[PDB]
Each structure stands twice: as structure tokens, then as C-alpha cells.
Design a protein around this ligand. Structure first.
Ligand SMILES: O=C(NC(=O)c1ccc2ccccc2c1)N[C@@H]1O[C@H](CO)[C@@H](O)[C@H](O)[C@H]1O
Ligand SMILES: O=C(NC(=O)c1ccc2ccccc2c1)N[C@@H]1O[C@H](CO)[C@@H](O)[C@H](O)[C@H]1O
Ligand SMILES: O=C(NC(=O)c1ccc2ccccc2c1)N[C@@H]1O[C@H](CO)[C@@H](O)[C@H](O)[C@H]1O
Ligand SMILES: O=C(NC(=O)c1ccc2ccccc2c1)N[C@@H]1O[C@H](CO)[C@@H](O)[C@H](O)[C@H]1O
Ligand SMILES: O=c1[nH]cnc2c1ncn2[C@@H]1O[C@H](COP(=O)(O)O)[C@@H](O)[C@H]1O
Ligand SMILES: O=c1[nH]cnc2c1ncn2[C@@H]1O[C@H](COP(=O)(O)O)[C@@H](O)[C@H]1O
Ligand SMILES: *Cc1c(COP(=O)(O)O)cnc(C)c1O
Ligand SMILES: *Cc1c(COP(=O)(O)O)cnc(C)c1O
Lengths: 810, 810
């Protein structure tokens, strides 16, 4: 049908059809007469999966032969989404499979909807790991993703009476065709025990053993025949575990609980023992694999030349003392040499400056669970603080500020300080964020070792986030500039010469309209809600956090409603305001915000005077597969975090690539986005970081804004009096109290500028031609935000390896 | 190589080789360079598995079209063993696969040793279900086996310091290629709750729900292209289960524990709640399947014409009140009509007369877990006792004896009485056992309803228990009488005309010698123990129970040892005495017996004066795959239970088919075996049932035997004084105390006759020609003990269906 989806040759189509029928019969044990749509999905999945095998075996044997430097990306989260369409895209099989299934009397898009998301992450950090794997494979790097195979990923969100309910994400129920179990490569992981000091150094003894069983998932590069591996560990009890009899067998669950469920708290660090076990589990098993592979090529001098370990946040920070443990205790290397190797091997990426999110493990937990690692941490700390004292003699306060050990009621280990000490590179994820790191929370470390600190601005893969989710846009772009931009997104700059092209303007606007029509139909079919497809699609999708300020969006929505009620017969640009995202289960305020959004919707959507001029919809169960649907349909992207709080954002980039304009603060990657597109092509508002700082020094008084802005006062009165909850008039008292007395994120301070900026958005939307021209200027300058660019910078500036777009033989 | 293993045609061999290579590549994702023997096993397994698919689909669709009466065999145990060789045998693929693998440079027998046993049973009852499935498929019956997919089967037995240790049987660790998960056919099972009485009858409400997910395993008939299904249920938590958040997800384990582990207690009934849950779980899920299939053909009059349910012991006895529940509560049938349907549908098989093994569930457990079923049981009981009162007016003691409710400190439900009341047929498993049922424990029920009581003497499948495990014997038999005996074992009678045939005598003896050589080599390679292959292989393998009297065997062994020590320079027939079997983990005496056997071995095997004239070996981890090795190697089969205690035995039949002579009491199927072969061709000794009865009336005094038999006294003195345990002289005091003061099984009473009979065995073994001639007379008359005969009797006399050896189209 469309060019970017590849060739549908007679020979390929015939072959796909017969392999489909073979799998239906031999693999699924069904015949056409009782087969369901799910059976058909699995037959297709197995058929496409077959095409990965040869490339996967030969990629991995190629690495064994050529022995390049290996990149190990350690993460507790890999937010992969669906795999079927992505595999077809990267293998150039999409049109062929579409034709093959059409000829068998099936709709491939319907079959694609059956696949469960691999929801093994919370949001941005987990999705970044997924985009990175795609880019590393596309750039021909010998890269491995290592994590945990959670039996249950991020919870499915149900909305009941306006409240979030959580249910288990049983994503493995029907099986996972994309994983290959490797029980033969099972490895032991140790917990508890005690440290014994012999003549020949320390020994960790009397441990409890949990087995780590790997499951391998292929990661195909874009049309380069490279297939890398994501290896995820599953927890298994040893066979003599607890070995009255029946209870001992049932107690195996205790060991296997390690890989049972993803922790869904993305707001606040909680020192839970099970989480600590997960963190060590992934680290201990992974490092054995790394070392095995390094030995199968005595001398650890060459270790950093052959191995890079990237830590996705501090979550796998135990890699640093674990590497030291193995090198010192098992390999008998001297401390200083082991430390040199460790530092040159490890690099650390930070994802937030919010103090409550930083990992600070109680010493008493580490003492019980990992006694040897605590000893090693103490020794790392002593040697590090000796270096600080020599560099800054007499600066006693610096010593306590930089210590890996935090003093207080409970002693804690600062995992971020551990990561900086033990890594040769530390990076933030957007230019402003990396600057904030050097000026604020890690200032002392930057002064000691300035060379360690880098920036690596985030990116997204243009495969999933353009070609897969928005084929209509990919095609109209390809018609003008060819197909090379898919693996070289900078080429989108060529589209600037089409900003005055009448055909292209019309095509861009047509693709958006079709996407909006498709999404409007999806909302009725799956959720029974009606929307006007001619309205401006105003979208804020991301996890629910106070710093992300969904509340500020709520205030604007109520303002528009109140303005309509005040002057009903005046014209306003119709809007469909869509807010979606999950709240961490223990985050009370976030759960209240969800309830507020639905409550606003209940009043607004049923007011006859409003009509179809304003609609407020909460998008339930926001996840990767839903993002692929809503983002192509969006007109306006809400990126409205308080300046200095959102480290980067990546959703922002997805919307820019897909033809939405952005209303945003100068925060995270928004700054660089506006810089690329031009500030005149961006809807920028609000305090800058400097203005926030000035307000903090003076003290933030919300009452001032309430007193001086009548429209804001009205909203607060409505909230307080029970206008949005007639049967429970005090329902939103917590929200009001927070806004008035303890708002860390200064919602009121940005309100006026936000409302004014929103008026400028509505004004431009009235001029479809000028709206679309500005859209073209955004799409054309989105190239920097490809994760291919990001990964190439990691490769060259941190890992010390060269990327290549060169094909492996098919 | 050998004829009975089928053809190895050029076309088949070429096809098997390429499909093997395809699976290695596409299914296992390996290449020849890093593939291990386990990978090669799985490639072969998948290759053979492919050949089952077409036949499986067409057998099941054939049943849907022809709508025959369906047989449902309900069991908590299916002791299947390995599947690969059995599948090859039944499909006539063995020689072809042997050649195919040979040409790829592999040894198929080595690959076969990699497969784990499916150890989903304890012993005879579980293995009977497995033999029955094979025979039902071979006789073309529309039969389904329904049970539980235990994650852990019967424990692996390790011997440490002479003691049994149990470890988890993690049989699913590497995957199971023989099962097909059917998550789409998941069904709900209800527990707890309460009973509500409305105008429209009773309702069971406020229940907890556990999901039952089926896994299907193919059961191929012998070369008839029939492939039946064994459906095993796995427990799954519903997605809103317990739905702080983390704990709720981890608590899903509580629901899923239902199918976690097989209960290994085969001696003593224990009223454990988890076991009750298992029993209802299998029954509730199975009955929904039965009813669904019956409806997919309103009128339940025809239900018994289309459905037979066979209860393997009382373990699935809840089927009776569950069927009543569904018919009365859900389908709205009147009680009397539902009861008529239930009785005509169900039949019950008893496997023991020992009172401690009978299921007697505390009322308080049923009240909490299954409140509606308890109400139904009470109602069944009232109506049943009304019938008894009308038949035997004024007989008040009969009423309390026959009641399903047992009075006492704790009220209990007698599940056996429930089964008799609710079944149209009740059978024992050997003629003497069925007679004992009618004369003793079920006498009252027999007097009320004599027509219900039947005999169905047990059998074993000649596929697994001759062709598979003893191909050498199968071949020499086939050379003389052809191949038809494999599915018509009565044809073995033709071998009587070869009893004086010199060539055949030599061939029978040669096959035995080769089997003994092969097993002697196995013992050295896998267990590092040396044996004389020229000695008489004296074998007792079965679960360790007091009634089975492994202790009597022990007494004989010590007698031979003491006789040798008394007259060292006298000639005795050399013996290798092999005892093997698992003890239930909580059965203290059985664990002591194992320790005694190893302790005897420790003294006997290291006495220089003994030499290689006597060896005592405990066969560790006795299971189906080990039985297939040891049984073909045996010369003497020990079947020495106290008369009236072993309901049938089936091991006895396996040994008879494989060319061993039997030393046994007139117990269980031994009686019929001796009747078939002729008493002159059997080594019969000891008390008959009548003699045991006479001894009980008088009172059994063990002291009498101790006082009057000097050789017995010596052994007891040796045991008491610490001759077999020098460092713990009182180790065996429990054994001695039991033998002297509370032996339910009269070990001393059979001692003299047993020892004398053993002398007659040794005498015959000195004459190899006459030994072998008697062996031929045994093999020739073993035909009755085919499970094909057993199943044909069930079919005709209980289920009301005709068997057929007719092929389905390939
Ligand atoms: O589709 C599957 N088919 C079988 O296991 C299968 C196929 C044919 C069979 C023929 C005879 C007997 C068993 C069979 C099982 N298995 C599924 O494979 C998935 C992807 O590898 C895996 O995730 C599932 O756990 C498994 O059920
Ligand atoms: O998603 C993020 N964090 C999490 O999901 C997360 C996960 C586990 C946590 C555990 C304890 C405390 C905070 C946690 C946050 N961070 C986001 O990372 C993106 C990728 O760099 C970035 O664009 C966002 O600005 C950042 O908030
Ligand atoms: O052998 C298996 N292979 C795969 O799952 C497989 C094969 C090829 C693949 C290619 C690319 C990505 C994943 C793949 C998985 N799976 C096993 O199938 C068994 C039998 O059906 C089942 O019991 C095991 O659970 C499963 O690991
Ligand atoms: O194996 C048997 N029983 C068990 O394994 C078993 C299983 C679970 C139990 C639970 C509670 C009490 C006893 C149990 C026995 N019985 C044997 O059945 C054979 C087949 O009919 C028969 O040949 C044997 O004589 C009988 O002991
Ligand atoms: O010992 C070896 N001999 C030959 N090939 C090997 C060996 N070790 C690893 N390989 C190849 O490297 C691939 C990946 O190995 P892994 O990354 O260590 O798991 C395998 O699939 C093999 O093709
Ligand atoms: O609804 C039906 N239409 C056609 N075939 C069916 C239908 N129901 C069952 N079958 C056939 O019967 C087989 C076994 O079904 P089951 O025993 O009910 O699980 C299936 O594999 C089908 O081939
Ligand atoms: C991209 C993405 C995110 C990250 O969005 P931000 O707006 O950067 O927080 C979160 N969830 C999903 C499902 C995503 O795809
Ligand atoms: C046949 C068999 C049994 C039954 O043996 P009996 O001697 O009849 O108790 C027990 N276990 C296994 C593994 C068997 O094969």
C-alpha cells in the first residue's frame, strides 16, 4: 500500500502464507475452523519470529569472532511495548505480512491489537532504555540490555467512580513468543550470610542462594541485519531449598518473589527490602555474565577496553561494589588496581534532581542483606574522603556533604555519591539538567572532578515513534526527501524548503485530520465516548506528578469553562482536552488529581450551554501502545513542569516529531527543542529557573496570587465549596490546602502567563494554514532528538566505541 | 536394527533429519557448534511431536462429529514417566528416528536419558491411570484423563548416611515439549462463601474464585492413529485478586499453591485443607468441561448415555455432590431425577482395605470450604439411610455403620460410603480384593445393592512394559509368533509350544543375561557400585510400606549372611539382592526400614568372607524410568505382602511379563497370576487370608516365633545389640519393638515358610535350563494381565461402550 513499509514480492508473500499455516497447525495445534483472532496473532508472531533467528545467531557469533568492546546497559526497567509491528518494520516485512494476511482473509491491524504490551517500566526512564536498545542495534554496537523479567509489569489502570484502581498486569498469561528461555545459563546469586576474615583476605559465607535464569529477547536494528540481545533474569529457588515437606516446597515462593512484580513508585524512594533484593539480583547475575564473556575471548588491565557498564540511574549502583568484590575477593587483585578497572568500566546517568527520589539505603538493611558490600562501600568512602581532604584541606563541611555515608537518626548510604565516586562519567539528560547538576546537588563533586561531568540530551527512536505509529506522515515525508531520514533524522531539515509548498501543507494537515478521525473512532468503539474531531486536540499524557503540574492544566480547563458560562454566545475555538497517566499507588495527591480531572469532566461534558465546544477526557491506562495512538492525533502538546524539575522529558519529543505544537515552560529538553525550532515556533511561557530561584529566596506566597487574580479566586472558591463534588463538598480540600499553603511547584505563579499563552494557541489554530506551516517548522527541526544521535554521543564520548550503519550479510 | 521397532525408509529418515535441523535452528535457536545433548533431545522431541499433531486434531474432530459416549477418567495422579520413546513406539517411528539420529552422529538412547519423568503419582494407583490411558487410546475409546498439573511431582530421593532425603522434583525446569497450554479454556472454581436460600432454591454466594487453566497432553494409541487427550489443570489467580499493592500481587501465590505439589503420603490419610482444595479443584473444573461438551452436541435424561465418569479411588469423590449441585442448583432439575443421572454416570474403584488409608473428611473443613456440598451430602445421607431402614427395618446398628456421616469426637464424612451410594458400579482391582470388599468393609452395602459390586483385575500396558523396556525379548517373541501379540497379549499362549525348543530356551536366557549385563554397567557408571552379573538378581521394588514387608526380605538377607558366616566354605547360589522404593516423608517406620537396608548392605558388602556371593543394594530414587531398567534385568520378583493387604499389585505383572520368576504370598493379583501360570511354576509361600484370620482370632504373639526359631532369635539379638550399627547400638530399637509387640503384618509368622521357599528358588537357579523353561511358562501365560483386557472389561461391564482395534485414516 505505502512505500516506507517495504516490498510485497510474490515469493515472500507465498512463503509467509505457508509458514503462517504451518504454525497454526504444528505450533498452535488448531485448524481454521476453531481458530480465534488470538490464534491468528500467535501464528503471525511465530512466522515473523522465524525471520529473526538466522540474523540473531550470526550477529552473536560475529561478536564472539571479532571480539569488539561490549556495551552493557543495566536497568531495572525496559518499557518495550508491543514487538510485532516493530519487528516487521525493522526487517522490512510489513507490506509483505499485510498482503499475506489479507490473502488469508485477515486484517493485520486487528491482529496487532491482540499483543500485550511488555510493560516492564514506569515511564520515561524505562522507555529511554527501550529506545536506546533500538538505536544501539541500528548503530551496529555490540550492546546488551540486562534487567529483570517481571511476572507482572506496570499495573493496568481502571477508573471506577472517578478513582484509579490498580489491577495486576498478567502479561505472560497467553505466553510470550518473543522470549527464549535459557535455563542452561542459570547462575547463583547470594544473599545474607556473614563475612569471614582469613589469611587470604575476606570470605562471604553462610549465604542463602537464589538462582537467576535468563530469558533472551531479540533486538533488531533497522534494516542492517543486526539483532542484539536483551537478557532478563527470572528468580528460581534451588532444588534443595528449605530441604514439613509440603511447606518447604511452598516456601520456594519466597525466593521467586524477587522477580514477581515491578515497583510502581516513580515519585518517592522507599527503602523496601524486596526492592533492594531486586537491585542486587540483576547486578550479581549480570556481572557473572560479563566476566564469563570477558574470559572467553587472567589480565584485568584490558577489562575496561572490552567492557562498558552503563547504569540507568542509581538502581543498579550495586554494580560498583559487586565488581570490586569479585575483583578483590575472587580474582585476588589489589584494591587500587581493581578500583582503577571499576572506575574506567562504569558510567552513571542521573534522571532527577528531586531529593525525595534519590536512593538512600539504610545501613542496617545493607548490613543484614549484603554484609560484604557494606564493608566495601565503607572502604570506598574512606579512600574517597581522603582525596577530598587532600584537595580541600580544612574544609570539614565539604567532607560531610560529600560522604557516601549520611549521618542522622538512621545512617544511610547515598547511592548517587557512590555512583559518582565509582564512575569515569556522570551525565544528565538535557543541557539545562546537566548544568543544574554541576551548580547544585553535585557541585562539590564537580569541583573535585570536573572532567567526569557530561551532558547527553535524551532522544526517541524514529522507528517506533514515527514510522510505526504514524505511517501516513512517514510516507508524505518520504515522497519528498526519500527514506534515508529514518536512520538519519537530521535529514528532516530538508523539509524547511517545503514550508511554502501548497501541496505539502495540505498533505501534512490531511495526515493529522486522518489521525484525529482514527483516534476519535477508537474512543467510541473501546470506551463509548463521543468527541468532535474538528476541535483542537489538547493533550497531556505522562505519569501523574505534582511537578508535572497536571493541576495547572486543570486550572486552565476550569477557566475556559467559566469564561464560556459567563459569555455563552461568544465564539471560542473548540477543544478536546485529554489528560492521561498512571499514579503511583501510594501517592495520595496524584490519586486526588485523577479524581479532580474526572470530576471536572463530569460537570463540563454534561453542560448543555457548553455543547461540543469543550470536552474533558481522562485517558485510561496510558501506556506505550496507547501513546502510539494518541500522539499522532495530537494538535497541542502540554509540557508544563515547573522550571528546573523535569530533567528532560521524552514525550515532548514524540509530539514534536508527530506534528503537534508545544506549549511549555523552559524546562528539560523543551529548552533545546525551542532552540532547534526557533522560539517563534514554540509556545513558551512562565518562570525560568532563575525566576523560580528568586521566588524561593523571597518566599513563595500563594495567597498573593489568589488575592490579585479574580478568575483564580473563583476557581478556588468553586473547588472549596463543592461545585465539582455536590455530594461530598469537601472532597478536594487537600488539593486546595496544598495549593494555598504548601505548593512546592508554584502552580499559581505560572497561571496568568499560561492562560495568556493558551489564548495565543487558540488564535493560531483559527488560521489552519499558519498553524500547519509552524508544524512543518517543528517536524523539520526535530532531528536532534533521535536516540541515534544520543547513542552516538554515548558511544564516542563515554564508551569509547565507533558506531556504523554498515550491514551484516543477510 | 530389530523388526518390532518398525521401518527405516529412505524418505522418512531424510524427512526426520531435516525437521530435526529445523527445530534446532528455529525452535531452540542454536547451531551445531554450541548445542549440548539436552538441545539435541529437545530437537528430537519437537520432531516426533510434529507427527502427533494431525492425528490429534483429527481424532478430536472425529469425536465431535460422531458424538460417541465419552469416558472421563478422574484421578489426582497420573504417573506417566518419559514420553519420547513411548510416542515413537506407538507411531512406529523408533527405527527411523534411530537411523536419522545415527546419521547426524548422535546416539538416540543417550538422548532418551535426558528426558525427565513426569512423576505425577506415588506408585501403583498413579501408574494404573497411565497404563489405562494407553489402553483406552489403543482400544479406540473416546477417553479423557483429567487431573492436576503439579509443578512438583513425587520428590527425588537422595540417600545420605543411609537415610532418605527428599528434594523437590522440578520437572518443568527445562520445559515440557509434550504439553499444550490452553489458556483460552480457563474456567473458574469457587471456594468458601455461604449458602443463601431464595424462593428459587439455594444459591452459593460470596465465594473466592481460583482459575483453572488446562494443559493438554496427547495420548497416542498403538499404531491405530488415535490420539486422545490428558487434560491437567493448573491453578491461576484472577487479575483483581486481593485488588498494599505489592503485597496483593505477592498474595496471588496463595491461590496458585493449589497445583504446586503432589502429596507424597500414600500410607495414611491426613485431613489437610490444601489437599481438599486440590480434590475439589480438579472435580469442579473437569465437570464444567464435561457439561460444556455434552451441551455442544437441555435434556439431561441422555447424560448417562453420553457420559461415564470413573473415580480413581475416593480422591475425586466430590464429583458426586458437585454433579448434584450443578444439576439441582444451576440446571433446576428435581432432586430424584438429578440423583438418577448422577448414579448412572459415576463409578468408583477402590484400591485398599486398610482403614488408615480411607478418606474421612472432618465436617468442619467441608463446612468452611464447601458449605453447599456439605448440605448436599447430608441430604444424600438422609435419603440413603431411609432406603436402608426400609430394607432392614429395626436394624439400628446397620444405620450407623452405613451412614456417610461418622459420629465421634470430630464428625467426619466417609468418602467411600459416599462413592458407593452415588455410583452404579463399585469395583476392586483383583478377584481376592473384590471378594474381601463384599465380605468385610463393604458387606452392608453389598447386602443392600449386590448388583453394584464388581471385579476388574488390574493390568499393565505391554507397550511400555515389554516393547519399550525390553526390545530384545519382544523381538525373539515376534520371530516365533509375529507382532500381533503387542495389542493382543493373549497370543503369548502360543509360546507354550516352544517350552522344549532348544533355540528358544537359549534365546530367552541370552536376552536376560544381556539385560543383566546392561543394568550391571548402569550401576557402575551412574552410582559407582560393583555387582556380579552371574548372580541371581533378587529384586523388591515398590513404595516402602509395612504391609509390603520389605522387613521380611531383610530378615531373609540376614539369614543368608549368618549361614555363610557359619559355614563359609560351603557353596551357595550367589545373589544380588536389590531393594528400592520411596518412603512417604512422615512415615517414620518406613524411613527406619530404608536405614536398615543400607545398614545391612554396609556390613554384608564389606565382609571379605562373603566375597561376591551376597550383595545388598538399595536402589535410590525408584521411579518409572528406573523400573523400565531394573525389571527386564530381574530373575526373582519379591511380592511378599501379608495375605489380604495388597489389593492387586502391578509391579508383579511387569516382572512376570519380563522373564522373572515370582516368590509371593497368595495376595492380590498374585493369586490369579499363579492360577494362569500354574501353581507349580510359582514360588508360593505363607499364610493365606484364612490363616491370617485364624491367627487374629487367637491373638498374634510374636514372642512364640522368637522362642521357637533359633535363627530368628539370632537376627533379633543382632538388631538389638547394635551389630548393624556399632556407633548407635540402639538405632533399630523401634523396629525390634514393633516386630516383637505390635506387628500388624505378622512378619515372624511367615518367616520359616519364606526361608524354605527361598531355598527352593536357589535350587532351581542351579539348573539354568529348568529355570528358563519355567520362565517361558510364566511369560506365555501373562496375557490376562494386559491393561487392554482390563479396559475392555470396564468398557463392556461398567461404561457400556464397545472397544475396537480399527484404524483411523492417517
Ligand atoms: O505454542 C506452543 N505450542 C506448544 O507448546 C505445542 C505445540 C505442539 C504440540 C504437539 C503435541 C503436544 C504438545 C504440543 C505443544 N507453545 C507455547 O510457546 C510459546 C512461545 O514459544 C510459549 O511462550 C508458551 O509458554 C507455550 O505455551
Ligand atoms: O521515569 C523516570 N523515573 C522513574 O520512572 C523512576 C523509577 C523508579 C524510581 C524509584 C524511586 C524514586 C524515583 C523513581 C523514578 N524519570 C524520567 O527519566 C526520563 C528519561 O531520562 C526523563 O526524560 C524524565 O525527565 C525523568 O523524570
Ligand atoms: O523452545 C522454545 N523456543 C522459543 O520459545 C523461541 C524460539 C525462537 C525464538 C526466536 C526469536 C525470539 C524468541 C524465540 C523463542 N520455547 C519452549 O517451548 C517449550 C515446548 O513448547 C516450552 O515448554 C518452553 O516453556 C519454551 O521455553
Ligand atoms: O498406589 C496406591 N495408592 C496410593 O498411591 C495412594 C495415594 C494417595 C493416598 C492418600 C491417602 C491415603 C492413601 C493413599 C494412597 N494404591 C495401589 O493401587 C494399585 C492400583 O490398583 C494396586 O495395585 C495396589 O495394590 C494399591 O496399593
Ligand atoms: O565456546 C564457544 N565456541 C564456539 N562459539 C561460541 C562459544 N562461546 C560462545 N560462542 C558463540 O557466541 C554466541 C553467544 O554467546 P554468549 O553471548 O556468551 O551467550 C553463541 O551463540 C555462540 O555462537
Ligand atoms: O464449535 C465447533 N465447531 C467446529 N468444531 C468444533 C466445535 N467445537 C469443538 N469442535 C472440534 O472438537 C475439537 C475438540 O473440542 P473440545 O473437546 O471441546 O475441546 C476441536 O479441536 C474442534 O475440532
Ligand atoms: C514517552 C513515554 C513517557 C514519558 O513521558 P514524559 O512526558 O517525558 O514524562 C511515559 N510513559 C509512556 C508510556 C511513554 O511512552
Ligand atoms: C508399577 C509401579 C509401582 C507399583 O508397584 P507395586 O509393586 O504393585 O506396588 C510403583 N512404582 C512404580 C514406579 C511403578 O512403575
Amino acid at each position: 500500500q505505502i512505500s516506507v513499509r517495504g516490498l510485497a514480492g510474490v515469493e515472500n508473500v507465498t512463503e509467509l502464507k505457508k509458514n503462517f499455516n504451518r504454525h497454526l497447525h504444528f505450533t498452535l495445534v488448531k485448524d481454521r475452523n476453531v481458530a480465534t483472532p488470538r490464534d491468528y496473532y500467535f501464528a503471525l508472531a511465530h512466522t515473523v519470529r522465524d525471520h529473526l533467528v538466522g540474523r540473531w545467531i550470526r550477529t552473536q557469533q560475529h561478536y564472539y569472532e571479532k571480539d569488539p568492546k561490549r556495551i552493557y546497559y543495566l536497568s531495572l526497567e525496559f518499557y518495550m511495548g508491543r514487538t510485532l509491528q516493530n519487528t516487521m518494520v525493522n526487517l522490512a516485512l510489513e507490506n509483505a505480512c499485510d498482503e499475506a494476511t489479507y490473502q488469508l482473509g485477515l486484517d493485520m491491524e486487528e491482529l496487532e491489537e491482540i499483543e500485550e504490551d511488555a510493560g516492564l517500566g514506569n515511564g520515561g526512564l524505562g522507555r529511554l532504555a527501550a529506545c536506546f536498545l533500538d538505536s544501539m542495534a541500528t548503530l551496529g554496537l555490540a550492546a546488551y540490555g540486562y534487567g529483570i523479567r517481571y511476572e507482572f509489569g506496570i499495573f493496568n489502570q481502571k477508573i471506577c467512580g472517578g478513582w484509579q484502581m490498580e489491577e495486576a498486569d498478567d502479561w505472560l498469561r497467553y505466553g510470550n513468543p518473543w522470549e527464549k528461555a535459557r535455563p542452561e545459563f542459570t547462575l547463583p546469586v547470594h544473599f545474607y550470610g556473614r563475612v569471614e576474615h582469613t589469611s587470604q583476605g575476606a570470605k562471604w559465607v553462610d549465604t542463602q542462594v537464589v538462582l537467576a535464569m535468563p530469558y533472551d529477547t531479540p533486538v533488531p536494528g533497522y534494516r542492517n541485519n543486526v539483532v542484539n540481545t536483551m537478557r532478563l533474569w527470572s528468580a528460581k529457588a534451588p532444588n534443595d531449598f528449605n530441604l514439613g515437606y509440603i511447606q518447604a516446597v511452598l516456601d520456594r515462593n519466597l525466593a521467586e518473589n524477587i522477580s514477581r512484580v515491578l515497583y510502581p513508585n516513580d515519585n518517592f524512594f522507599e527503602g523496601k527490602e524486596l526492592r533492594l533484593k531486586q537491585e542486587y539480583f540483576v547486578v550479581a547475575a549480570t556481572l557473572q555474565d560479563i566476566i564469563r564473556r570477558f574470559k572467553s575471548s587472567t589480565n584485568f588491565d584490558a577489562f575496561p577496553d572490552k567492557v562498558a557498564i552503563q547504569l540507568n540511574d542509581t538502581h543498579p549502583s550495586l554494580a560498583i561494589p559487586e565488581l570490586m568484590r569479585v575483583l578483590v575477593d575472587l580474582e585476588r587483585l589489589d584494591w587500587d588496581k581493581a578500583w582503577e578497572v571499576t572506575v574506567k568500566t562504569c558510567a552513571y546517568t542521573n534522571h532527577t534532581v528531586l531529593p525525595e527520589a534519590l536512593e538512600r539505603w539504610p545501613v542496617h538493611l545493607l548490613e543484614t542483606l549484603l554484609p560484604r558490600h557494606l564493608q566495601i562501600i565503607y572502604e570506598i568512602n574512606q579512600r574517597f574522603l581522603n582525596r577530598v581532604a587532600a584537595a580541600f584541606p580544612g574544609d570539614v563541611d565539604r567532607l560531610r556533604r560529600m560522604s557516601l555515608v549520611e549521618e542522622g537518626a538512621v545512617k544511610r548510604i547515598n547511592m548517587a555519591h557512590l555512583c559518582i565516586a565509582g564512575s569515569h562519567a556522570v551525565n544528565g539528560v538535557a543541557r539545562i539538567h546537566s548544568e543544574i547538576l554541576k551548580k547544585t546537588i553535585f557541585k562539590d563533586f564537580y569541583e573535585l572532578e570536573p572532567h567526569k561531568f557530561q551532558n547527553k540530551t535524551n532522544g526517541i527512536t524514529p522507528r517506533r515513534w514515527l514510522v510505526l505509529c504514524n505511517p501516513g506522515l512517514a510516507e508524505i515525508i518520504a515522497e519528498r526527501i526519500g527514506e534515508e531520514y529514518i536512520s538519519d533524522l537530521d535529514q528532516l531539515r530538508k523539509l524547511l524548503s517545503y514550508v511554502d509548498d501548497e501541496a505539502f501543507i495540505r498533505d501534512v494537515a490531511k495526515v493529522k485530520q486522518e489521525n484525529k478521525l482514527k483516534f476519535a473512532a477508537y474512543l467510541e468503539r473501546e470506551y463509548k465516548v463521543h468527541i468532535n474531531p474538528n476541535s483542537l486536540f489538547d493533550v497531556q499524557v505522562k505519569r501523574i506528578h505534582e511537578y508535572k503540574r497536571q493541576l495547572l492544566n486543570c486550572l486552565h480547563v476550569i477557566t475556559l469553562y467559566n469564561r464560556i458560562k459567563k459569555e455563552p454566545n461568544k465564539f471560542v475555538v473548540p477543544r478536546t482536552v485529554m489528560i492521561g497517566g498512571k499514579a503511583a499507588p501510594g501517592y495520595h495527591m496524584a490519586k486526588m488529581i485523577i479524581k479532580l480531572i474526572t470530576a471536572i469532566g463530569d460537570v463540563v461534558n454534561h453542560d448543555p450551554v457548553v455543547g461540543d465546544r469543550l470536552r474533558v477526557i481522562f485517558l485510561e491506562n496510558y501506556r506505550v501502545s496507547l501513546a502510539e495512538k494518541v500522539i499522532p492525533a495530537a494538535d497541542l502538546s502540554e509540557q508544563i513542569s515547573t522550571a528546573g524539575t523535569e530533567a528532560s522529558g521524552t514525550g515532548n519529543m514524540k509530539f514534536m516529531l508527530n506534528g503537534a505544537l508545544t506549549i511549555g515552560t523552559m524546562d528539560g529538553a523543551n529548552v533545546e527543542m525551542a532552540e532547534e525550532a526557533g522560539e517563534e515556533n514554540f509556545f513558551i511561557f512562565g518562570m525560568r529557573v532563575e525566576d523560580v530561584d528568586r521566588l524561593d529566596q523571597r518566599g513563595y506566597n500563594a495567597q498573593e496570587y489568589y488575592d490579585r487574580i479574580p478568575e483564580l479566586r473563583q476557581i478556588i472558591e468553586q473547588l472549596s465549596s463543592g461545585f465539582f463534588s455536590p455530594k461530598q463538598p469537601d472532597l478536594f480540600k487537600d488539593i486546595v490546602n496544598m495549593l494555598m499553603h504548601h505548593d512546592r511547584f508554584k502552580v499559581f505563579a505560572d497561571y496568568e502567563e499560561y492562560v495568556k499563552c493558551q489564548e495565543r494557541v487558540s488564535a493560531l489554530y483559527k488560521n489552519p494554514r499558519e498553524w500547519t506551516r509552524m508544524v512543518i517548522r517543528n517536524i523539520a527541526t526535530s532531528g536532534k532528538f533521535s536516540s541515534d544521535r544520543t547513542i552516538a554521543q554515548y558511544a564516542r564520548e563515554i564508551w569509547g566505541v565507533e558506531p556504523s550503519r554498515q550491514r551484516l550479510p543477510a
